Design a binder for this molecule. Structure first.
Ligand SMILES: [Mn+2]
Ligand SMILES: [Mn+2]
Lengths: 485, 99, 399
């Protein structure tokens, strides 16, 4: 539990300098989990046995002075919607409880190759649908900064585990902000790479056109490092982009004077809280004091983010989840005597209220007579939302504004209010629709609850995001606070 | 507005989701609210705008036609709750009352 | 009174090494669910990867079908729950089918009639669900096998024109070398849509989809039976309705198995997991050239040049091998007519009587060439050819 607060960068060197044995690095982690998660509750399946085994293997490699891997002996947590071979992946749903993947996802493939240590899986909303992880069929994770508050959705477990010092880095999935929002709420660094930057082979789908895996760390630097270890095209993912340059650390540490930063006026709209707004405005000032040039611009179609997002996401969801019938795997209803029942009973009994809501909406949005009026329309709106960015990027390097309209909300506050629960995706959804890369870093606190600052960049321009993200981080961050909780 | 029991049960059927009449009504409203929520897009001028199917501008991603032996039968059935003779066992009585 | 409108929805199994959207081998053994993987099993988190050859072949058969090859073509999802379709959706093509508006000429009791083939897209075959007891056994071995759907413009007008259609189609595809096209093997399946509309008015009577047509000869049986079936209905009284009917091989009658409540909702929408296709000229050429001389122009070449009759030119161009064999043995030294008469019957009748359809691994052009000359002007005549042929065919090469 000692190096439980060290960054991936330092901890990385501590191992290379043989100042610490991999096996103890793990001993610490689990020691941490054992003491903190009972209260946080961010971890699902724990892979301790295997973890210990790998570390034991690493100690040898340490002595033999053969420490290869961008994340050698680095503890890692993985969202339970990302397939891990032999490790129970449930997507935090009854439907997949006990499910043991028979193949390895591409990100885990790469991570293992970099010799990272798999400590466990993180809790999440059921099937990435949700903004507070409260929909989990197993437990409700809590915000390390305020246990009376939520971690965020859907990767709440990933943001909380990192903030709670259970792991140095973790993976999450973003479809509409499921990485950035939980990041903002827990005041940690979250990054949803450009669509196509990180393979999707091995990611239990929610919205094939919006889904994307990303890293969550306690600081901008470590976050870049991890994204280097997972980025890269893959023959198992046809949509994976053929972009070789996967170095994101190069331009970190360089100044941002002259950097053209676009501040969408709609991002400081009416749906934004007062304290959140202030925080980001002082942020804007900070970005100025650093040299960057920030001027207001308009992302008109922003207001249509959430609506179009849901229609699209839900629709696809009404297709990606249809494979869950309890035939080849997953929850198999016992009270079924006919073939129709088996489907209608396994599915209903296995999915939770929210998942079924998306499905109903989606299935409807696609059905005959409504397809054009909802799905097609939403798709056309999506085109608008991207143009907005297209135009803006014609004169600006990056875009800035809050990540979430308000600080983290109370547990059970909006759990029974899906519509307001949705409003929280106001500032995130546009990015997934545009397929651009976004990143959130903490930039304030209101009543102890952290506020998120987001940086929206051009496709495959993550290096620039890290450049401006690191600069700002130097003027503000919560590095010293996680340690105190 | 106007989301009948019928439609609600037609989608459920289209989704293979069992719903009791005591959930139907409830779902009729929820859907309606969500739909009214979805209705917002209509205030966006999309005249002559092409739908966005893919956000990434890739092209022709094909795979060379070269086979790769499949996994063992055991592996393919390892997670199936119901199996018989190396296959997935399932009901099938065709009666317009269960189907 | 009535013109009977009928169309044929035909699927063909492309014989490629691996599957359509999965590296799994397209050919499998006898062990069920042994020729699969996470993709074919629709495990969570799996994605489709398009078979390049499947496309080239798909667009090769589409061209030979006199269709317009799409420049931009993307796949879409056909959503429907069924034990042999694990993803609950079949990756296929809705708009932008790789091939559109084609045709093929056919000869029916009368003269030439050009029937149009509206489209030709690519799909993935489903698994096979065996019905044991009050339960069902599923085998995804076949699941994911590349297919191509060929819908006919509703031009064919009779149970015979249908037959003529399937044969000419089967014939042409066979020449592209993209499928064994055998119905007795499943590498060629056919469904028929039939509806009658009394002359004078535009309204139709009932419309039914015939299922379980498993042989060229069978589609005709059901078709013409159905024709008469709703022929009575239309006259006697008949209650107009959209329906689906199963054809009983034994009795020879079609059985109503369900009445459409409307138009099946498949919620078609563009597969996001597969980036769009952009078939350029260079590409269209590569596959353009890779096409031989199809049956028609191959038959017209048997008309004036090498002035052969009609019945002759039809059965010789029936298959590519047959036709190649004939032309390979023609140059060798066998007199035109000689072989023609020798192939038409004799060899054809030998193949049918011995099921030795593998016209290749048996007697050869080099071998058969001789027997022709031996009779032509060498030894005497015919009758000796009675047995010298079978022996010479099943093995050996000359004597
Ligand atoms: Mn089909
Ligand atoms: Mn059909």
């Amino acid at each position: 539990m000692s190096i439980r607060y060290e960054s991936v960068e330092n901890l990385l060197t501590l191992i290379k300098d043989k100042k610490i044995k991999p096996s103890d690095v793990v001993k610490d982690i689990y020691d941490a989990i054992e003491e903190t998660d009972p209260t946080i509750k961010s971890f699902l399946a724990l892979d301790k046995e295997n973890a210990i085994k790998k570390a034991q293997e690493l100690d040898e490699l340490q002595a033999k002075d053969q420490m290869d891997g961008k994340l050698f002996g680095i503890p890692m947590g993985i969202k339970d919607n990302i397939i891990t071979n032999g490790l129970e992946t449930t997507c935090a749903s009854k439907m997949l409880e006990g499910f043991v993947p028979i193949y390895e996802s591409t990100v885990m493939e790469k991570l293992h190759k970099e010799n990272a240590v798999l400590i466990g899986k993180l809790n999440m909303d059921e099937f990435a649908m949700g903004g507070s992880t409260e929909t989990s069929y197993f437990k409700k994770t809590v915000n390390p900064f305020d246990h009376k508050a939520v971690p965020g959705g859907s990767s709440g477990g990933s943001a909380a585990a990192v903030a709670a010092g259970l792991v140095p880095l973790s993976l999450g999935s973003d479809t509409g902000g499921s990485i950035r929002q939980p990041a903002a709420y827990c005041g940690v660094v979250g990054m949803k790479p450009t669509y196509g930057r990180v393979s999707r082979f091995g990611l239990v789908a929610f919205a094939s056109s919006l889904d994307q895996i990303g890293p969550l760390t306690r600081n901008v630097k470590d976050n870049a490092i991890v994204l280097e270890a997972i980025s890269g095209a893959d023959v198992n993912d046809s949509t994976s982009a053929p972009v070789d340059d996967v170095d994101f650390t190069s331009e970190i540490g360089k100044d941002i004077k002259g950097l053209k930063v676009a501040l969408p006026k709609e991002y400081l709209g009416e749906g934004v809280a007062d304290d959140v707004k202030e925080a980001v405005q002082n942020a804007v000032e900070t970005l100025k004091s650093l040299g960057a040039v920030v001027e207001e611009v308009s992302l008109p179609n922003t207001k249509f983010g959430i609506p179009s997002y849901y229609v699209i996401a839900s629709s696809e969801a009404s297709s990606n989840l249809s494979r869950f019938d309890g035939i080849r795997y997953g929850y198999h209803s016992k009270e079924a005597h006919s073939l129709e029942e088996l489907y209608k009973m396994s599915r209903s009994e296995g999915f939770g209220k929210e998942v079924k809501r998306r499905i109903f909406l989606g299935t409807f949005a696609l059905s005959s007579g409504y397809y054009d009026a909802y799905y097609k329309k939403s798709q056309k709106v999506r085109t608008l939302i991207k143009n907005d960015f297209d135009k803006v990027f014609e004169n600006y390097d990056v875009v800035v504004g809050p990540t979430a309209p308000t600080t983290a909300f109370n547990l059970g506050e909006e759990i029974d209010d899906p519509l307001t629960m949705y409003a929280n995706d106001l500032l995130t959804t546009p990015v997934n629709l545009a397929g651009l890369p976004g990143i959130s870093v903490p930039c304030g606190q209101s009543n102890g609850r952290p506020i998120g600052l987001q940086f929206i960049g051009k496709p495959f321009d993550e290096k620039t995001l890290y450049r401006v993200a690191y600069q700002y981080e130097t003027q503000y961050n919560l590095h010293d606070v996680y340690e105190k909780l | 507005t106007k989301v009948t029991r019928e439609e609600v049960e037609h989608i459920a059927n289209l989704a293979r989701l069992q719903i009791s009449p005591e959930e139907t009504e409830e779902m009729a409203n929820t859907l309606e609210s969500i739909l009214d929520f979805a209705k917002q897009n209509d205030s966006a001028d999309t005249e002559g705008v092409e739908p966005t199917y893919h956000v990434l501008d890739l092209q022709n991603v094909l795979r060379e036609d070269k086979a790769i032996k499949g996994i063992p039968q055991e592996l393919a059935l390892k997670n199936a709750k119901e199996t018989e003779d190396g296959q997935f066992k399932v009901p099938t009585i065709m009666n317009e009352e269960d189907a | 009174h009535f013109e009977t409108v009928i169309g044929l929805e035909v699927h063909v199994e492309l014989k490629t090494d691996s599957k359509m959207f999965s590296p799994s081998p397209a050919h499998f053994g006898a062990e069920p669910n042994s020729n699969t993987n996470v993709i074919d099993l629709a495990y969570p988190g799996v994605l489709p990867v398009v078979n390049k050859r499947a496309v080239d072949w798909a667009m090769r058969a589409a061209m030979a079908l006199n269709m317009e090859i799409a420049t931009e073509s993307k796949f879409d999802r056909k959503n429907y729950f069924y034990p042999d379709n694990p993803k609950a959706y079949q990756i296929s093509q809705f708009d932008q089918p790789i091939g559109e508006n084609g045709y093929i000429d056919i000869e029916v009791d009368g003269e030439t009639k050009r029937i149009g083939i509206t489209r030709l897209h690519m799909e993935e075959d489903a698994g096979k669900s065996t019905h044991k007891g009050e339960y069902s056994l599923v085998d995804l071995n076949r699941q994911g096998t590349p297919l191509i759907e060929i819908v006919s413009e509703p031009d064919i007008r009779s149970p015979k024109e249908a037959y003529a259609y399937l044969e000419k189609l089967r014939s042409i595809i066979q020449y592209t070398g993209v499928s064994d096209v055998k119905m007795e093997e499943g590498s060629l399946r056919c469904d028929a849509n039939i509806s009658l509309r009394p002359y004078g008015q535009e309204k139709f009577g009932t419309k039914a989809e015939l299922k379980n047509l498993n042989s060229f000869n069978y589609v005709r049986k059901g078709l013409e039976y159905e024709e008469k079936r709703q022929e009575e209905e239309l006259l006697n009284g008949g209650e107009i309705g959209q329906e689906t009917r199963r054809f009983d091989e034994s009795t020879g009658k079609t059985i109503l198995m369900r009445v459409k409540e409307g138009s099946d909702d498949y919620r078609y929408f563009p597969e996001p997991d597969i980036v769009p296709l952009y078939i350029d000229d260079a590409w269209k050429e590569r596959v353009r050239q890779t096409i031989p001389e199809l049956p028609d122009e191959r038959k017209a070449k048997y008309v004036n040049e090498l002035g052969l009759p009609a019945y002759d030119a039809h059965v010789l161009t029936l298959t590519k091998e047959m036709s190649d064999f004939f032309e390979s043995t023609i140059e060798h030294g066998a007199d035109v007519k000689l072989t023609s008469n020798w192939l038409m019957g004799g060899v054809n009748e030998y193949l049918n009587k011995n099921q030795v359809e593998l016209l290749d691994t048996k007697l050869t052009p080099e071998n058969l060439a001789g027997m022709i000359k031996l009779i032509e002007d060498g030894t005497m005549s015919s009758k000796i050819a009675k047995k010298v042929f079978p022996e010479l065919a099943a093995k050996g090469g000359n004597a």
